[PDB]
Short mmCIF file of C-alpha atoms and ligand atoms in Angstrom, two decimals:
data_model
loop_
_atom_site.label_atom_id
_atom_site.label_comp_id
_atom_site.label_asym_id
_atom_site.label_seq_id
_atom_site.Cartn_x
_atom_site.Cartn_y
_atom_site.Cartn_z
CA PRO K 14 56.88 -48.32 56.51
CA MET K 15 55.49 -44.81 56.52
CA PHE K 16 51.86 -43.76 56.67
CA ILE K 17 50.72 -40.18 56.04
CA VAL K 18 47.20 -38.81 56.57
CA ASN K 19 46.22 -35.36 55.28
CA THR K 20 42.71 -34.30 56.32
CA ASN K 21 40.46 -31.27 56.70
CA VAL K 22 39.31 -32.64 60.05
CA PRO K 23 40.36 -30.19 62.84
CA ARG K 24 43.30 -30.98 65.12
CA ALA K 25 40.99 -30.91 68.15
CA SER K 26 39.03 -33.81 66.65
CA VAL K 27 42.08 -36.08 66.48
CA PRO K 28 41.74 -38.42 69.50
CA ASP K 29 44.41 -39.18 72.11
CA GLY K 30 46.12 -42.40 71.10
CA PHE K 31 45.58 -42.05 67.36
CA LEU K 32 49.23 -42.11 66.24
CA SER K 33 49.94 -45.06 68.52
CA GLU K 34 46.96 -47.03 67.23
CA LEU K 35 48.07 -46.41 63.66
CA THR K 36 51.63 -47.45 64.52
CA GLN K 37 50.57 -50.72 66.13
CA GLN K 38 47.86 -51.70 63.65
CA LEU K 39 50.20 -51.00 60.74
CA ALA K 40 52.97 -53.07 62.33
CA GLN K 41 50.50 -55.95 62.60
CA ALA K 42 49.10 -55.48 59.09
CA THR K 43 52.45 -55.20 57.30
CA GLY K 44 54.31 -57.68 59.48
CA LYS K 45 57.07 -55.11 59.93
CA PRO K 46 58.57 -54.27 63.34
CA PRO K 47 56.74 -51.40 65.07
CA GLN K 48 60.16 -49.81 65.66
CA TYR K 49 60.34 -49.15 61.91
CA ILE K 50 56.81 -47.76 61.50
CA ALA K 51 56.48 -44.00 60.99
CA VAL K 52 53.15 -42.16 61.09
CA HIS K 53 52.31 -38.58 60.19
CA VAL K 54 48.92 -36.91 60.68
CA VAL K 55 48.15 -33.50 59.16
CA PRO K 56 44.84 -31.90 60.31
CA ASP K 57 43.11 -28.63 59.41
CA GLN K 58 43.89 -28.94 55.71
CA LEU K 59 42.28 -26.99 52.88
CA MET K 60 40.96 -29.79 50.70
CA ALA K 61 37.97 -31.04 48.74
CA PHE K 62 36.79 -34.47 47.63
CA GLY K 63 34.27 -34.52 44.79
CA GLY K 64 34.20 -30.74 45.11
CA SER K 65 32.74 -30.99 48.62
CA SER K 66 34.57 -29.80 51.74
CA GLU K 67 32.92 -32.38 54.00
CA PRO K 68 35.48 -34.41 55.97
CA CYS K 69 37.88 -36.29 53.74
CA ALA K 70 41.41 -37.69 53.77
CA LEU K 71 44.27 -38.09 51.32
CA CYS K 72 46.75 -40.73 52.49
CA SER K 73 49.97 -42.48 51.52
CA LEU K 74 51.42 -45.81 52.60
CA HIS K 75 55.05 -46.53 51.69
CA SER K 76 56.55 -49.96 52.33
CA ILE K 77 59.45 -52.03 51.07
CA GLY K 78 57.40 -54.97 49.86
CA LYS K 79 54.14 -56.15 51.44
CA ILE K 80 52.32 -54.09 48.81
CA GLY K 81 49.96 -55.77 46.37
CA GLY K 82 46.43 -56.40 45.18
CA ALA K 83 44.98 -58.36 48.10
CA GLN K 84 47.24 -56.77 50.69
CA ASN K 85 46.31 -53.23 49.62
CA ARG K 86 42.60 -54.06 49.84
CA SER K 87 43.23 -55.32 53.37
CA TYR K 88 45.14 -52.14 54.30
CA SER K 89 42.30 -50.05 52.88
CA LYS K 90 39.69 -51.82 54.98
CA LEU K 91 41.85 -51.38 58.08
CA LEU K 92 42.79 -47.75 57.47
CA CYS K 93 39.36 -46.63 56.24
CA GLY K 94 37.88 -48.34 59.28
CA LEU K 95 40.17 -46.37 61.59
CA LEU K 96 39.57 -43.05 59.83
CA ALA K 97 35.81 -43.61 60.05
CA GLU K 98 35.89 -44.65 63.71
CA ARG K 99 38.39 -42.08 65.00
CA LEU K 100 38.03 -39.07 62.68
CA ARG K 101 34.46 -39.74 61.51
CA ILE K 102 35.51 -39.66 57.86
CA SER K 103 33.36 -41.56 55.37
CA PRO K 104 35.36 -44.33 53.64
CA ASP K 105 34.21 -43.12 50.22
CA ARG K 106 35.90 -39.77 50.90
CA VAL K 107 39.31 -41.32 51.53
CA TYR K 108 42.08 -41.96 49.02
CA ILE K 109 45.17 -43.96 49.98
CA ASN K 110 48.08 -44.17 47.55
CA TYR K 111 50.19 -47.31 48.02
CA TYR K 112 53.88 -47.30 47.12
CA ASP K 113 56.05 -50.41 46.90
CA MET K 114 59.44 -48.83 47.56
CA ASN K 115 62.67 -50.44 46.38
CA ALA K 116 65.12 -50.90 49.25
CA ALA K 117 67.68 -48.82 47.34
CA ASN K 118 65.22 -45.92 47.20
CA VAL K 119 64.59 -45.61 50.93
CA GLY K 120 67.09 -43.67 53.00
CA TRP K 121 67.59 -44.18 56.73
CA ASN K 122 70.39 -43.85 59.29
CA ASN K 123 72.96 -42.25 56.96
CA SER K 124 72.41 -44.83 54.22
CA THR K 125 69.64 -46.83 52.54
CA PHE K 126 68.21 -50.32 52.90
CA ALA K 127 70.29 -51.48 49.95
CA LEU K 128 73.39 -52.73 51.76
CA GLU K 129 74.23 -55.66 49.48
CA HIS K 130 76.15 -54.07 46.61
CA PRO Y 1 42.50 -38.15 40.48
CA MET Y 2 44.27 -36.20 43.21
CA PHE Y 3 45.91 -32.80 42.87
CA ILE Y 4 48.10 -31.32 45.61
CA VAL Y 5 49.60 -27.81 45.66
CA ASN Y 6 52.16 -26.73 48.24
CA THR Y 7 53.05 -23.03 48.08
CA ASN Y 8 54.59 -20.18 50.10
CA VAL Y 9 51.75 -17.89 49.03
CA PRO Y 10 49.64 -16.70 52.02
CA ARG Y 11 46.35 -18.42 52.88
CA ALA Y 12 44.56 -15.09 52.38
CA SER Y 13 45.79 -15.03 48.78
CA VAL Y 14 44.00 -18.29 47.97
CA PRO Y 15 40.68 -17.21 46.44
CA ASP Y 16 37.45 -18.77 47.66
CA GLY Y 17 36.24 -21.15 44.99
CA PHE Y 18 39.79 -22.14 44.05
CA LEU Y 19 39.26 -25.75 45.16
CA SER Y 20 35.99 -25.86 43.21
CA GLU Y 21 37.67 -24.39 40.13
CA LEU Y 22 40.51 -26.92 40.31
CA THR Y 23 37.98 -29.71 40.68
CA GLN Y 24 35.99 -28.64 37.61
CA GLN Y 25 39.04 -27.98 35.43
CA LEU Y 26 40.70 -31.28 36.34
CA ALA Y 27 37.52 -33.24 35.67
CA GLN Y 28 37.34 -31.62 32.25
CA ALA Y 29 41.04 -32.16 31.52
CA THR Y 30 41.27 -35.78 32.66
CA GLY Y 31 37.83 -36.86 31.50
CA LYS Y 32 37.21 -38.24 34.98
CA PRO Y 33 33.94 -37.42 36.77
CA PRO Y 34 34.23 -34.64 39.39
CA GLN Y 35 32.95 -36.96 42.12
CA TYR Y 36 36.30 -38.78 41.97
CA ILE Y 37 38.52 -35.68 41.91
CA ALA Y 38 40.32 -34.64 45.11
CA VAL Y 39 42.15 -31.34 45.57
CA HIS Y 40 44.42 -30.13 48.35
CA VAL Y 41 46.04 -26.71 48.72
CA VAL Y 42 48.71 -25.96 51.31
CA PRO Y 43 49.60 -22.23 51.68
CA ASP Y 44 52.08 -20.43 53.92
CA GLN Y 45 54.80 -23.00 53.35
CA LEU Y 46 58.49 -22.49 54.05
CA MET Y 47 59.95 -23.05 50.58
CA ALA Y 48 62.69 -21.96 48.23
CA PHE Y 49 62.97 -22.36 44.47
CA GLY Y 50 66.41 -21.70 43.00
CA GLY Y 51 67.47 -20.26 46.34
CA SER Y 52 64.72 -17.62 46.24
CA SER Y 53 61.61 -17.34 48.43
CA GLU Y 54 59.51 -15.47 45.87
CA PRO Y 55 56.16 -17.18 45.15
CA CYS Y 56 56.57 -20.78 44.04
CA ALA Y 57 54.70 -24.08 44.14
CA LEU Y 58 55.48 -27.78 44.32
CA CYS Y 59 52.58 -29.89 43.08
CA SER Y 60 51.58 -33.46 42.32
CA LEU Y 61 48.91 -35.00 40.12
CA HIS Y 62 48.03 -38.65 40.69
CA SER Y 63 45.74 -40.41 38.24
CA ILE Y 64 44.87 -43.94 37.22
CA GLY Y 65 45.68 -43.61 33.54
CA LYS Y 66 45.37 -40.37 31.56
CA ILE Y 67 49.02 -39.67 32.35
CA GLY Y 68 51.53 -39.39 29.52
CA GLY Y 69 53.78 -37.27 27.34
CA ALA Y 70 51.28 -35.05 25.55
CA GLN Y 71 48.66 -35.22 28.28
CA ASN Y 72 51.12 -34.04 30.93
CA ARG Y 73 52.17 -31.12 28.75
CA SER Y 74 48.51 -30.16 28.51
CA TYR Y 75 48.07 -30.52 32.28
CA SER Y 76 51.13 -28.35 32.91
CA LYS Y 77 49.83 -25.49 30.76
CA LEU Y 78 46.43 -25.73 32.45
CA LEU Y 79 47.73 -25.93 36.01
CA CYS Y 80 50.50 -23.35 35.68
CA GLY Y 81 47.92 -21.06 34.10
CA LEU Y 82 45.62 -21.40 37.09
CA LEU Y 83 48.44 -20.96 39.60
CA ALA Y 84 49.63 -17.86 37.74
CA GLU Y 85 46.17 -16.31 37.34
CA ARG Y 86 44.81 -17.22 40.78
CA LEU Y 87 47.84 -17.31 43.07
CA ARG Y 88 50.13 -15.01 41.08
CA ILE Y 89 52.84 -17.67 40.91
CA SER Y 90 55.14 -17.53 37.90
CA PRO Y 91 55.05 -20.74 35.80
CA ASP Y 92 58.84 -21.00 35.84
CA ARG Y 93 58.69 -21.33 39.63
CA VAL Y 94 56.33 -24.32 39.59
CA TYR Y 95 57.15 -28.03 39.60
CA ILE Y 96 54.43 -30.63 39.08
CA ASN Y 97 55.17 -34.33 39.65
CA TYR Y 98 52.90 -36.61 37.61
CA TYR Y 99 52.09 -40.15 38.75
CA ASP Y 100 50.33 -42.83 36.73
CA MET Y 101 48.81 -44.93 39.51
CA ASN Y 102 47.89 -48.59 39.14
CA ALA Y 103 44.28 -49.26 40.14
CA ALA Y 104 45.51 -51.86 42.64
CA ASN Y 105 47.63 -49.20 44.37
CA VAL Y 106 44.84 -46.72 45.05
CA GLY Y 107 42.67 -47.33 48.10
CA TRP Y 108 39.14 -45.96 48.38
CA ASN Y 109 35.92 -46.93 50.14
CA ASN Y 110 37.37 -49.82 52.20
CA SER Y 111 39.01 -51.41 49.15
CA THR Y 112 40.97 -50.44 46.03
CA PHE Y 113 40.11 -49.91 42.37
CA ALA Y 114 41.31 -53.43 41.61
CA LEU Y 115 38.00 -55.25 42.02
CA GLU Y 116 38.55 -57.84 39.31
CA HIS Y 117 40.90 -60.43 40.77
CA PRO Z 17 65.47 -31.58 41.81
CA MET Z 18 63.25 -31.04 44.83
CA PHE Z 19 63.65 -31.96 48.47
CA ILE Z 20 60.91 -32.00 51.11
CA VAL Z 21 61.43 -32.38 54.88
CA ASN Z 22 58.49 -32.99 57.22
CA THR Z 23 59.45 -32.93 60.90
CA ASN Z 24 58.02 -32.58 64.40
CA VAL Z 25 60.88 -30.24 65.33
CA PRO Z 26 59.49 -26.77 66.20
CA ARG Z 27 59.73 -23.98 63.64
CA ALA Z 28 61.82 -21.88 66.04
CA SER Z 29 64.43 -24.65 65.99
CA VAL Z 30 64.98 -24.35 62.25
CA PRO Z 31 68.14 -22.21 61.98
CA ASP Z 32 68.61 -19.16 59.78
CA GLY Z 33 70.25 -20.32 56.56
CA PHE Z 34 68.81 -23.85 56.52
CA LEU Z 35 66.94 -23.65 53.20
CA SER Z 36 69.95 -22.05 51.54
CA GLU Z 37 72.33 -24.71 52.83
CA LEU Z 38 70.03 -27.48 51.61
CA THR Z 39 69.79 -25.80 48.22
CA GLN Z 40 73.54 -25.45 47.76
CA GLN Z 41 74.51 -28.84 49.16
CA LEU Z 42 71.87 -30.55 47.02
CA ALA Z 43 73.11 -28.66 43.96
CA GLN Z 44 76.56 -30.05 44.73
CA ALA Z 45 75.45 -33.62 45.37
CA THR Z 46 73.10 -33.95 42.39
CA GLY Z 47 75.33 -32.13 39.91
CA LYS Z 48 72.51 -29.75 38.99
CA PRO Z 49 72.72 -25.93 39.16
CA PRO Z 50 71.32 -24.39 42.38
CA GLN Z 51 68.81 -22.34 40.37
CA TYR Z 52 67.12 -25.67 39.56
CA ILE Z 53 66.86 -26.84 43.17
CA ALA Z 54 63.63 -26.50 45.16
CA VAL Z 55 63.47 -27.07 48.92
CA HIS Z 56 60.49 -27.34 51.26
CA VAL Z 57 60.66 -27.61 55.05
CA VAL Z 58 57.62 -28.38 57.18
CA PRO Z 59 58.12 -28.05 60.98
CA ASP Z 60 55.76 -28.59 63.92
CA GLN Z 61 54.31 -31.78 62.45
CA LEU Z 62 52.30 -34.37 64.36
CA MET Z 63 54.33 -37.53 63.83
CA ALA Z 64 55.82 -40.58 65.46
CA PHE Z 65 58.67 -42.89 64.50
CA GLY Z 66 58.73 -46.32 66.12
CA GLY Z 67 55.86 -45.20 68.31
CA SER Z 68 57.89 -42.35 69.82
CA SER Z 69 57.45 -38.61 69.28
CA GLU Z 70 61.10 -37.74 69.80
CA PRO Z 71 62.48 -35.65 66.91
CA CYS Z 72 62.13 -37.38 63.56
CA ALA Z 73 61.80 -36.54 59.89
CA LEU Z 74 60.06 -37.93 56.82
CA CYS Z 75 61.61 -36.66 53.58
CA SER Z 76 61.47 -37.02 49.82
CA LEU Z 77 63.95 -36.29 47.05
CA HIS Z 78 62.77 -36.16 43.44
CA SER Z 79 65.24 -35.96 40.57
CA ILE Z 80 65.25 -36.71 36.86
CA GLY Z 81 68.03 -39.27 37.01
CA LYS Z 82 70.93 -39.15 39.47
CA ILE Z 83 68.96 -41.65 41.55
CA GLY Z 84 70.45 -45.05 42.31
CA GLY Z 85 72.10 -47.38 44.80
CA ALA Z 86 75.37 -45.63 45.61
CA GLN Z 87 74.05 -42.15 44.84
CA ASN Z 88 71.14 -42.54 47.25
CA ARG Z 89 73.42 -43.76 50.02
CA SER Z 90 75.50 -40.63 49.44
CA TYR Z 91 72.41 -38.39 49.52
CA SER Z 92 71.33 -40.08 52.75
CA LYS Z 93 74.67 -39.49 54.47
CA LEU Z 94 74.58 -35.85 53.35
CA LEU Z 95 70.97 -35.20 54.33
CA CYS Z 96 70.97 -37.14 57.61
CA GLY Z 97 74.15 -35.25 58.47
CA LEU Z 98 72.44 -31.90 57.93
CA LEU Z 99 69.29 -32.93 59.79
CA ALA Z 100 71.35 -34.13 62.75
CA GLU Z 101 73.59 -31.05 62.83
CA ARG Z 102 70.94 -28.42 62.12
CA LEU Z 103 67.74 -29.88 63.56
CA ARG Z 104 69.25 -32.29 66.08
CA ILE Z 105 67.35 -35.21 64.59
CA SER Z 106 68.96 -38.62 65.02
CA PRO Z 107 69.76 -40.28 61.67
CA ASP Z 108 67.99 -43.49 62.66
CA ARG Z 109 64.76 -41.50 63.03
CA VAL Z 110 64.85 -40.17 59.47
CA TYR Z 111 63.29 -41.72 56.36
CA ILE Z 112 63.96 -40.36 52.88
CA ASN Z 113 62.01 -41.59 49.86
CA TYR Z 114 63.93 -41.27 46.60
CA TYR Z 115 62.09 -40.88 43.29
CA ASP Z 116 63.73 -41.18 39.89
CA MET Z 117 61.35 -39.06 37.82
CA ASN Z 118 60.78 -39.50 34.09
CA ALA Z 119 61.27 -36.14 32.35
CA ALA Z 120 57.82 -36.56 30.80
CA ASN Z 121 56.32 -36.73 34.30
CA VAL Z 122 57.76 -33.45 35.57
CA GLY Z 123 55.88 -30.26 34.75
CA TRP Z 124 57.43 -26.79 34.75
CA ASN Z 125 56.79 -23.47 33.01
CA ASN Z 126 53.67 -24.58 31.12
CA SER Z 127 55.24 -27.79 29.78
CA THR Z 128 57.32 -30.80 30.83
CA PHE Z 129 61.01 -31.66 30.57
CA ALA Z 130 60.44 -34.28 27.88
C1 956 A 22 66.07 -25.28 31.95
N1 956 A 22 65.92 -26.23 33.07
C2 956 A 22 66.31 -27.56 32.89
O1 956 A 22 66.77 -27.92 31.82
C3 956 A 22 66.16 -28.47 33.94
C4 956 A 22 66.56 -29.83 33.75
N2 956 A 22 66.89 -30.92 33.59
C5 956 A 22 65.63 -28.05 35.15
N3 956 A 22 65.41 -28.99 36.18
C6 956 A 22 66.54 -29.80 36.70
C7 956 A 22 66.13 -31.28 36.74
N4 956 A 22 64.78 -31.42 37.34
C8 956 A 22 64.57 -32.31 38.31
O2 956 A 22 65.46 -33.10 38.62
C9 956 A 22 63.24 -32.35 39.06
C10 956 A 22 62.59 -31.32 39.61
C11 956 A 22 61.45 -31.66 40.23
C12 956 A 22 61.12 -32.95 40.23
S1 956 A 22 62.34 -33.77 39.37
C13 956 A 22 63.66 -30.58 36.85
C14 956 A 22 64.07 -29.11 36.80
C15 956 A 22 65.24 -26.72 35.34
C16 956 A 22 64.71 -26.31 36.56
C17 956 A 22 64.32 -24.99 36.74
C18 956 A 22 64.47 -24.07 35.71
C19 956 A 22 65.00 -24.48 34.49
C20 956 A 22 65.39 -25.80 34.30
#
């Protein structure tokens, strides 16, 4: 899985341990091995939410499976909780786009995850 | 809705009020209320279009509904027009990826927009 | 087509000629003219892969068609090869998301490709 956070929160406000916490909590939430979890945090962005430049975040979570109605609501509670606690971003100024990726459409290690045919 | 612009145009060339203008124009175009519109502009990028590093942009528009053949043509004219007028980027050096998002696949405010089941 | 690379490799470690090589090799692999190919490289990123901040890359390739099982494996071999050679990123620390775009969902020059 891959999780990307774009935010107008300054780099200096991103706490020590943030990437690691995301990595571990996402491994637990998705049930995927932490060795396969990638995280990407992009601070100091020029963005607006509702026209306001108060702290906000635009996020993506990509996973092969483990994406769905109830699961995505669970991820949102987890991830919004972390963004609020660590970056002080209000949950109602966060968007997270969820993508259920087909194994054939994810490249890794010179190939993809479609090794069957 | 969420609109992202990545461009090699300098930060200084992004006019103040550009995010506000995008927010207002997108609310009008999509029929969505401005409170739910997010905008993100990323200048000074290392990019090429057709092998050339003249001004260009790679963009995305994510929306729950309001994405489609004729609507996307209308969005393209609107958005290219703004990028041309405001950032001086030629419309034939702009790509915009459109995404019709399912409500269940967009997280916000500790949950998603699938509140029904 | 368009290809984006986000990496924690420093900007100074991106070699002269990299964008051009990506453009031409992607033109070759996708069967589309190089004047159609867009490339975007984002160095100095704050990222981790498997909990480690050794060099890694998160990428995307969008194309109207030319996306599929065997084709994507070929793109991956090509792109991981370039990232390893040019940016010294290990292939098992690269992800590439492939998107088969509908022509109606790609805007360009005031319209779409539908
Ligand atoms: C005249 N013309 C085309 O007919 C097509 C055609 N066909 C072009 N593209 C190649 C296929 N495309 C893609 O695969 C994508 C580009 C960005 C996301 S998907 C869109 C641009 C194209 C691109 C740039 C300029 C003219 C172009």
